[PDB]
């Protein structure tokens, strides 16, 4: 509760400062072995108001947006996004037509330059070494990682532990 109160006090200088502060703390927590702490801090940050574009849930697409995040924050968001995807397929509540990762958003999408972007390669390698060769790239967009519903049907995925 002391941590939540200090977070509430800090959430008064602006979302511009808040996003950078959360990026810094998430990178630190991820690269210091505190994956569970990073996940819980991201969870308490989401309901605060920071990273409003992080998650989208609907019959069409389940998306995770990381273009504004750091490498550490992207890994933490991907870790909890993959876990939530595994929560479905345990119930008969249908499945979205598509699951995407917004690695790069902007003009770079319609170009091959975004293919070599650090965010894109980092997200692709994380997905490849966690859920095998299931999340492939998009043949129309140069900054998205996609996975069709058929490949979702065949799909706790990431182990979150404190060092």
């Amino acid at each position: 509760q002391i941590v939540e109160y200090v977070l509430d006090k800090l959430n008064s200088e602006g979302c511009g400062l808040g996003i950078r502060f959360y990026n810094a703390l998430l990178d630190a927590l991820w690269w210091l072995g505190q994956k569970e702490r990073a996940a819980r801090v991201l969870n308490e940050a989401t309901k605060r108001g920071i990273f409003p574009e992080l998650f989208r849930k609907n019959k069409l697409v389940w998306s995770v947006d990381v273009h504004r995040m750091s490498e550490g924050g992207m890994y933490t968001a991907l870790s909890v996004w993959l876990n939530d995807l595994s929560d479905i397929l345990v119930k008969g509540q249908d499945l979205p037509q598509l699951a995407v990762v917004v690695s790069v958003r902007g003009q770079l999408e319609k170009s091959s330059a975004a293919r070599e972007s650090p965010i894109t390669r980092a997200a692709f390698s994380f997905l490849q070494d966690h859920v095998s060769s299931s999340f492939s790239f998009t043949g129309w967009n140069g900054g998205r990682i996609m996975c069709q519903r058929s490949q979702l049907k065949q799909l706790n995925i990431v182990a979150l532990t404190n060092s």
Binding site: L98, G139, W140, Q148
Partner: peptide, 14 residues
């Protein structure tokens, strides 16, 4: 324009 992109556009447009 693959069949995958066409099907996705069909669903989203519908």
């Amino acid at each position: 324009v693959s069949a995958l992109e066409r099907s996705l556009r069909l669903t989203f447009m519908d």
